[PDB]
Amino acid sequence: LVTAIGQTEPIAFVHLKDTEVQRIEENLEGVRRNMFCVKPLDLNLDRHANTALVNAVNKLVYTGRLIMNVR
Amino acid sequence: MAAMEANIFCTFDHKLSIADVGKLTKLVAAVVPIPQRLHLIKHYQLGLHQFVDHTRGYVRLRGLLRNMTLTLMRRVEGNQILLHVPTHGLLYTVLNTGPVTWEKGDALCVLPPLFHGPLARENLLTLGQWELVLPWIVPMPLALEINQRLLIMGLFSLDRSYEEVKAAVQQLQTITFRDATFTIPDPVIDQHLLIDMKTACLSMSMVANLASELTMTYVRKLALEDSSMLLVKCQELLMRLPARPQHVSPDDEIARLSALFVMLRQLDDLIREQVVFTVCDVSPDNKSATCIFKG
Amino acid sequence: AMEANIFCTFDHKLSIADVGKLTKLVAAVVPIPQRLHLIKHYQLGLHQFVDHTRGYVRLRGLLRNMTLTLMRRVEGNQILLHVPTHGLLYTVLNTGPVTWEKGDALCVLPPLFHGPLARENLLTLGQWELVLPWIVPMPLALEINQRLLIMGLFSLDRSYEEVKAAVQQLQTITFRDATFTIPDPVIDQHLLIDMKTACLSMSMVANLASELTMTYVRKLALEDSSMLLVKCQELLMRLDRERVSPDDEIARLSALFVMLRQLDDLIREQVVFTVCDVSPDNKSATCIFKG
Amino acid sequence: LSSVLEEFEVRCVAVARRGYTYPFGDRGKARDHLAVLDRTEFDTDVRHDAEIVERALVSAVILAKMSVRET
Amino acid sequence: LSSVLEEFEVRCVAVARRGYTYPFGDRGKARDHLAVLDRTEFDTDVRHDAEIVERALVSAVILAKMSVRET
């Protein structure tokens, strides 16, 4: 992880299939496209991948990517 | 009051036959438990014989005998006996009244007698319609299994037909351990077992709760790759039924194990007995051996 | 009038530097296989018991049968060995990495290392080597085995590096004034056979507890007046929450107890000493003996 | 009485099960209150069915106040 | 069958808990049918379902006669 000052870490998902990565970004694009309709429809993440914290944070990051884009 | 005397003189009031006065000379340096701890105890209180009862609860003798102070036989003479109580940690020799081949370096425990089968009972030594009864000293593996067999016999006795119990008591009362055969006199069910079964039944449940999810599952998972003789022979006893662990919390897991050890000592001790001897070099005759940690 | 002491004679000739290497270890626990009066130096220490595939647990048990003995005096040829008598005080070297303090319930454990040490040096004949067991305080001695057992439970799955991060935490206990790094019993992913048995010794027991309890608790519940047994079945029925010949019951119960006797070596621990005064700089301390 | 009489046994089974759980300020006094609650049944006679509810109900109401430590 | 079978699965073990509470004149005989009922399971194969019900009935009527005490 970055330690140099002035380099705040960009928000990013950790260890996910590219089919899951690029596709969920389109759902975030719909907030900028039409924020009147906002649902957390995606739930495709599998617990079989990675471990506890690596997957549980991703459910939180999607809400954090959403709460910023809605605002 | 004086501290209870290490030296104890036991004197018979009943006449002694010449054939029996030499029976005690061969009995010298052997465990002779007493209860009252008098400086001049009467022989009527001597020996286990006063504790016998029509119930003949062998488990009942197993408990009441432990309360008695142990003593070492010493100084046979004319109508006089001198029992002695070694202080803790000192070494002193001990003859084995029982018929068991002691090993070097093993711990020993006092146990109520188990009749050999033929029950010739030697000259047994008797007077006044009374017989001396000296509990046998036994090796730990025999001392351990003798308790669990009394407990498992009480578990099978529950919840099953009384005629079926006899088929289990027959195979369980026998003990072929260490060459010589053994058999348990009257293993009557008792309230003393009901509390002994209670502490086992209490430990039987809580250990299943204290066990970690990674602990109980582990035996089922080892079979997926490793294979061995012990893995196969043990797996058959279990009920018939890669992957990530559901969670790994080293602080939460180390705590689950520390509590688990306490219930094991709560459960293991009921088959354990108060170790008394720690024999070193057994004599070649196998009629005597030195001991330590007595008391 | 001199106190009795075991004699012992080294075979290989010693240089004057070697006999002085031993006089630095006056007080020192020395296990003895059997209370023989004479003893060859090959019998001294755990080194005769040293093994590869056999695990640490085998040393945990055979050491309990070893006769601990201090080296009361060191000379040429013969070496005296004073077996402690219970209740007497005995000065002992602090060979153990843990610092001693007042009143500790010391108990012996086999020596361990975490790769190279700043000073592995000890008396060394050709091929032969001496090994002096640690004298750890009791609360840490439970912490040792509690870590060693859990670390082998994960040995079946080294493949997940996230699990290794937990193993790295168990690997380094941090008692005060100490920085331990307990070696992994596992080597090249494969378990030692002693580790494979110790893990089987416990997991088999917890598995039988999950099912065998469902029967005997039922008949024994109504008879009890204390009621404490009556609520024990509640957690067992909630232990189901996730998702037979009569002779089979006897053989099934029979294994449950005998495995605990195999497991007892890792459970209860005798204390061999209890500390009194401690010498300055903690080089050593007197400890009244207690079997 | 149909199923409704059977329904009284269902909810009674839950209170009887949790009465072995929650700690109280006594032990042997509440012990009789639980076992008598476990003795509740329904007699073959129709007129006598009220007698079981008449006593088992009073034993249960006392148990609830003890959790509150109510007088 | 699976919809009715789910109701059969709930009514199955519910009979077993009543059997432990009910005293019998031979404590050992009662478990031999209760142990089969506690072992109940439903494999995907429907061919065995005619056999699954049979042991469920052998564990049923034979147990009910013991309560009536008819031989």
PDB file of C-alpha atoms in Angstrom, chain B residues 72 86-94 102 105-108 275-281 289-295, chain C residues 34-35 67 83-86 289 291:
ATOM      1  CA  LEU B  72       2.985 -50.164  55.497  1.00  0.00           C
ATOM      2  CA  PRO B  86       5.569 -43.097  55.169  1.00  0.00           C
ATOM      3  CA  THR B  87       5.804 -39.341  54.768  1.00  0.00           C
ATOM      4  CA  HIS B  88       5.049 -37.939  51.328  1.00  0.00           C
ATOM      5  CA  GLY B  89       7.856 -38.084  48.772  1.00  0.00           C
ATOM      6  CA  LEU B  90      10.219 -40.478  50.573  1.00  0.00           C
ATOM      7  CA  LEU B  91      11.037 -43.869  49.054  1.00  0.00           C
ATOM      8  CA  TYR B  92      10.270 -47.199  50.746  1.00  0.00           C
ATOM      9  CA  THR B  93       9.789 -50.780  49.554  1.00  0.00           C
ATOM     10  CA  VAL B  94       6.353 -52.356  48.984  1.00  0.00           C
ATOM     11  CA  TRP B 102       4.667 -54.777  37.792  1.00  0.00           C
ATOM     12  CA  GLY B 105       8.851 -46.780  36.080  1.00  0.00           C
ATOM     13  CA  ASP B 106       5.042 -46.923  36.233  1.00  0.00           C
ATOM     14  CA  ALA B 107       2.661 -45.333  38.728  1.00  0.00           C
ATOM     15  CA  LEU B 108       0.389 -47.462  40.926  1.00  0.00           C
ATOM     16  CA  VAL B 275      -1.563 -42.303  42.373  1.00  0.00           C
ATOM     17  CA  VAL B 276       0.419 -43.586  45.333  1.00  0.00           C
ATOM     18  CA  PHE B 277       3.475 -45.456  44.040  1.00  0.00           C
ATOM     19  CA  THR B 278       6.094 -44.641  41.382  1.00  0.00           C
ATOM     20  CA  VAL B 279       8.091 -47.875  41.236  1.00  0.00           C
ATOM     21  CA  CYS B 280      11.671 -47.759  39.978  1.00  0.00           C
ATOM     22  CA  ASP B 281      13.639 -51.032  39.788  1.00  0.00           C
ATOM     23  CA  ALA B 289       9.357 -53.509  44.461  1.00  0.00           C
ATOM     24  CA  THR B 290      10.544 -50.129  45.720  1.00  0.00           C
ATOM     25  CA  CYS B 291       8.112 -47.208  45.758  1.00  0.00           C
ATOM     26  CA  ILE B 292       8.072 -43.411  46.057  1.00  0.00           C
ATOM     27  CA  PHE B 293       5.378 -40.722  46.479  1.00  0.00           C
ATOM     28  CA  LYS B 294       3.516 -42.917  48.978  1.00  0.00           C
ATOM     29  CA  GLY B 295       0.489 -41.429  50.703  1.00  0.00           C
TER      30      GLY B 295
ATOM     31  CA  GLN C  34      15.967 -44.904  35.135  1.00  0.00           C
ATOM     32  CA  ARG C  35      17.238 -44.626  38.694  1.00  0.00           C
ATOM     33  CA  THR C  67      14.080 -38.677  36.742  1.00  0.00           C
ATOM     34  CA  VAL C  83      18.296 -36.500  42.880  1.00  0.00           C
ATOM     35  CA  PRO C  84      15.946 -34.046  44.648  1.00  0.00           C
ATOM     36  CA  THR C  85      13.973 -35.186  47.681  1.00  0.00           C
ATOM     37  CA  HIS C  86      10.468 -33.791  48.066  1.00  0.00           C
ATOM     38  CA  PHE C 289      11.145 -28.988  45.387  1.00  0.00           C
ATOM     39  CA  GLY C 291       6.784 -33.447  43.002  1.00  0.00           C
TER      40      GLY C 291
END
